[PDB]
Design a protein around this ligand. Structure first.
Ligand code: HEC
Ligand code: HEC
Ligand code: HEC
Ligand code: CU
Ligand code: CU
Ligand code: CU
Ligand code: CU
Ligand code: CU
Ligand code: CU
Lengths: 456, 456, 456
């Protein structure tokens, strides 16, 4: 009598169904223990962590997080790890929930071009993080080597309408947030736990806009929530909703009716959500600068009838979500590609600036640049802008306060500095503004902003 | 059948009673669902975050945290948000516990001089954070835009003798801890989660000394504990006591008999305390440098009979609480004002130095400067001090070790450096010491300390 | 009727049995309340925080964490604190679980050479942190002044086969991780919560290798887990296993069947582990850079029969644990001593480099330097190494990529930079490699690495 003692494996071996985020393999739907064969392949590959920002990820199965594994408590798992011949590093795995030293690390050590296997019985029901366990472990985990394995209870989880896979991670780029180009891993930021990005599913906007999760009013949604870390603890929160329940790993304790829950580094939870009114529900790390300054936001979008007795308000918009209220920011991807190619047009910059202007600028100056007479000066046919377009660069970088006059109206207010914006973002935003609302046109270049940022 | 389905509103509309911290509105004390009208006004205003340190807070209702809202599960809330015409920024609100996208953010968007409303049914019982949800959200939250809303269970919470409102926040000033003057918000420290202050209720000493919470031996105290963040998770702890219970948001789980509990960023809990012996109980973030180096301490002061069989010890003092054992440090406020005015007297400095000397210096050199023969040299009629008063500045900033002689007694010990003290604090402490215990008198200036700090 | 109201003390006074980590005093094994006399002495002393790295710890009872205290709920504790005459600082104590202001702080204030006492009834059952409460509190806690006190329930905890004492802390050295020499406390890193070390029981390798905790297959292990902080929250995790249960302080909630659990700063928990298969189980802070870059790993080593049906895999090794897979790194201690003495031999460096080569280098280049043809170039009789031994220093510090040829085989791969290695570590590793596998011999000095690190 160990736990998860259900018998020796019966029937034929089952090849495990591994899914890519944000999807989950189907419930095993069986009453007997099985020998489950898992084949997982490590791939090292460049992917976009943000628009026009590439990163060399180390992946289980080509994604961050890695492929989702689903087995049944009592199963015997024969775990095959392949390391693709293109890999430069060796890799291995530690699966939380494994009973044995290293969670499989020693026996799963796998050089590029090789394959390893070890076998384990899944004694422990629950949701568990797996990750690479190769020195230096922090580097392998920071580069994206984590995912979830579910060990079902023998009777399976209660049925829901949808099951999704969401995994938080902290990332450490040499360059700053949204600085374009291929970004190396930064060991110094990693050791200090100062990530440049905090993401769901390996990228900014991975689960926003046209990539949101979906359900309908009345449906139940189970989310398998991982925190791969490596270093951060998530104040994991759903905006505008509540979790019916939150259960950590294989724990006996189940919390019900909470909105904010702490997920340890390396931790995992199953949360349940019941859709009650339509609109966009935001999954965040409520350490707010992560959610709103580093990418740590995901969307569950609910379709169906409004319930005015429950909520009279409008759908989420750019005031809260900023530039992620849109379907995508693919104009920024295209403008960055054109810059690298030396083929950047005015229109490339305009469309990029339009994407970034949302929230960042429109919260005060409005979508149409009209502002609000006497409170927020207009950017639309702005005489003050026209009178010295170049100074707009200083205003964005270093802010503006004091008495000014715009389209012959008096303002005495404060525009905070926005120095975190990269040279290309300032250039594109300002090029957008100059080419909108009958402004004079022309363009601002990243190089122009670089020169101004460097002026003391 | 949604939750909190108690009927349509009955009776007349109720104007919500909003309280300022640390007080709470009274229990709604009713058996029927109501239409509750809430009017909350945003005010941007300078307040003292520390003695002689001003900060431009963004507030719900003129305080940090913002006004406390109390309604009943099943109530229909008509939420009016006004943004005062003096505001420079637009603002809005996201109330945790609201069922709907953004927790009210889109419909509550409110320019300076304007008013917005949206309606929501309070389906979810519990204690919930609300906060501003205006891009850039981290900035609005960092500037103080958070508070708590309680949704009572339909039968109301159990009666206690006292209900208080305590909310932790992390703050990001350009200047260092206790550097005097009007301190701007520092976006860089905020993004990096490196706060200069960690406070309860928007200021150092907000809940210490003459501003402590009160109760008596035998009474029960309920505290509504918020963490507005934006970024920090509180290792929330009561020194010298225990919580009878800790309940997060609307959760079904209630923890009992704990002293230390983790509150997520954006999280809230109700804690219960039973006073058993008199004295000062300290609420801290037990990430100790926050509690003892950044302001994260609050006091619950208990009156009544000593129980020597339970505790024989003395009341908290300056050894633990340092300069917050006193009623206030208002001498520091007055000395800083006089400096700005150019009217700083020797006595202004003396009284300021006396406030700061407690804990900081008195732990070793004693309240009376006598020290302890052969262990801690005296500052009282100190020949070593008199022999070169100027060098006292180097001793405070950079510490002192090695063999010295003072009032013809031998010392060979270590005075740690105290370089975190600002120029004005060193000047005032040393001016206090020179004017006490028959020392030679004179004064040390901030400018003198500035010159020494700059010497290599 | 207060809690823990079991009567007045009966029988003779009991002198409390205090143990040194990782051991625990025996169960009190009694059915009556007692007067328990505790005598705890503060000692300030240099100890090795890492091999060849000394730190001036401030200790309760000569260890970090301090001596373990065990009493029974309902006991009257007469607490004597002595501060050894060698101390330079005054000290005192705050015991979590004490009912009274400061947890004993005011009455336990104790100058060097003095003794204090206060009395308290242990009303609250549970595991509790104690720590020093002397301004500046963060400094005293950072220097090691914490431990655990257990208050047993009146019937005692359930019997287990083993009880161990593990306490996490964050430490703040002026120098970087593994920089040799006597390291001062760094107030700036402490205030910023940027520790250089994160340790169990006051040192790197305190609970690894020949110092691992032990049990056998089938036995139950209770671990009293403290987090003294001062600042960090532990994502406390056991690699390759599960906790049967996790109970915080005196809480009524008990979590069962979890692998990862958040321990607040100043928090404590009792965890239970049932050994099911042999090998090394790693206790970590799963904020991974702490566990793998700063020292936050401890071992529970299980003896007994392999269960191939549960786990087919091999024992933990250097791939995961790196240089802590070995019994000790005492060659590094000896090489550092010899350097300070000016008697550093080639063999001293070789044996030190051999200790550090494990994981750090062997994960790719193998234990025998053979590498893996076409993937990892060999260090064994390496023509590329021999061709310019000096350049090996640049390769270690700054990494190597691009097409190279070694023992006439083509490589085009990436060796990451390893700039975190100190001058002495690079020197010793390279001296080890030059003196192994028929390489040319010679030696590299710390001074050689210093010059290269400084080259731009
Ligand atoms: C509200 C917090 C604002 C955000 C976000 C942005 N701007 Fe702004 N801007 C704002 C104020 C209150 C003022 C007037 C400052 C004063 O001294 O009273 C401004 C000013 C400008 C100007 C110059 C005036 C004009 O042409 O109307 C420009 C060109 C401008 N702002 C542009 C701008 C851009 C491009 C932004 C996004 C990057 C942006 N602003 C944000 C208030 C706020
Ligand atoms: C205990 C940790 C101390 C605190 C806090 C402060 N001081 Fe100190 N001081 C201390 C020691 C052990 C010594 C002797 C150092 C040695 O080499 O043995 C000192 C020395 C001084 C002196 C010079 C000697 C004298 O005049 O008595 C001065 C002027 C002094 N200390 C002042 C001082 C002030 C103003 C402090 C608060 C800012 C302070 N000290 C803190 C021990 C400790
Ligand atoms: C895998 C991540 C590695 C670790 C850890 C270390 N090394 Fe390495 N090394 C590696 C590769 C893929 C290469 C070839 C780089 C290329 O451009 O293809 C290297 C190269 C070296 C060399 C030069 C070649 C040789 O002599 O074989 C030396 C001297 C070397 N490496 C030494 C070295 C030492 C001492 C390490 C621990 C500090 C170490 N390496 C780690 C891959 C990896
Ligand atoms: Cu890997
Ligand atoms: Cu892990
Ligand atoms: Cu706001
Ligand atoms: Cu929120
Ligand atoms: Cu101490
Ligand atoms: Cu404490």
């Amino acid at each position: 009598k160990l736990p998860g003692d259900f018998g020796p494996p019966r029937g034929e071996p089952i090849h495990a169904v591994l899914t890519s985020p944000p999807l989950v393999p189907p419930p095993v739907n069986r009453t007997y223990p099985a020998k489950v064969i898992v084949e997982l392949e490590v791939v090292e590959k460049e992917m976009q962590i943000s628009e026009g920002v590439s990163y060399t990820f180390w992946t289980f199965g080509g994604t961050v997080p890695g492929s989702f594994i689903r087995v049944r408590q009592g199963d015997t798992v024969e775990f095959h790890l392949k390391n693709h011949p293109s890999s430069k590093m060796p890799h291995n795995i530690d699966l939380h929930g494994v009973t044995g030293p290293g969670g499989g690390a020693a026996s799963s050590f796998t050089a590029p071009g090789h394959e390893s296997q070890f076998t384990f019985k899944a004694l422990n029901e629950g949701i568990y993080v797996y990750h690479c366990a190769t020195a230096p472990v922090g580097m392998h985990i920071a580069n994206g080597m984590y995912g979830l394995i579910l060990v079902e209870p023998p009777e399976g989880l209660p049925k829901v309408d949808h099951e999704y896979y969401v995994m938080q991670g902290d990332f450490y780029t040499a360059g700053k947030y949204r600085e374009k180009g291929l970004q190396p891993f930064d060991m110094e930021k990693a050791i200090d736990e100062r990530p440049s990005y905090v993401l769901f599913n390996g990228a900014e906007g991975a689960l926003t806009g046209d990539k949101a999760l979906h359900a309908k009013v009345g449906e139940t949604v189970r989310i398998f929530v991982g925190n791969g870390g490596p270093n951060l603890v998530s104040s994991f929160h759903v905006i505008g909703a509540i979790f019916d329940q939150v259960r950590y790993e294989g724990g006996t304790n189940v919390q019900k009716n909470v909105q904010t829950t702490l997920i340890p580094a390396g931790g995992a939870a199953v949360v349940k959500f019941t859709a009650r009114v339509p609109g966009s529900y935001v999954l965040v790390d409520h350490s707010i600068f992560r959610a709103f300054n580093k990418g740590a936001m995901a969307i569950l979008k609910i379709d169906g009838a409004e319930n005015k007795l429950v909520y009279s308000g409008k759908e989420l918009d750019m005031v809260y979500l900023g530039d992620r209220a849109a379907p995508n920011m693919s104009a920024v991807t295209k403008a960055t590609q054109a810059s690298v190619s030396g083929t950047l047009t005015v229109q490339d910059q305009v469309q990029a600036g339009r994407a970034l202007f949302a929230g960042t600028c429109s919260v005060c100056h409005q979508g149409n640049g009209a502002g609000l007479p006497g409170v927020f000066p207009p950017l639309a046919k702005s005489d003050f802008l026209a009178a010295d377009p170049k100074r707009a660069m200083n205003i964005v970088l270093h802010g503006l306060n004091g008495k000014i006059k715009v389209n012959g109206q008096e303002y005495d207010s404060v525009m905070p500095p926005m120095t975190q914006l990269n040279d290309d973002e300032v250039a594109n935003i300002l090029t957008y503004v100059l080419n909108s609302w009958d402004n004079p046109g022309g363009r601002v270049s990243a190089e122009d902003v670089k020169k101004v940022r460097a002026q003391p």
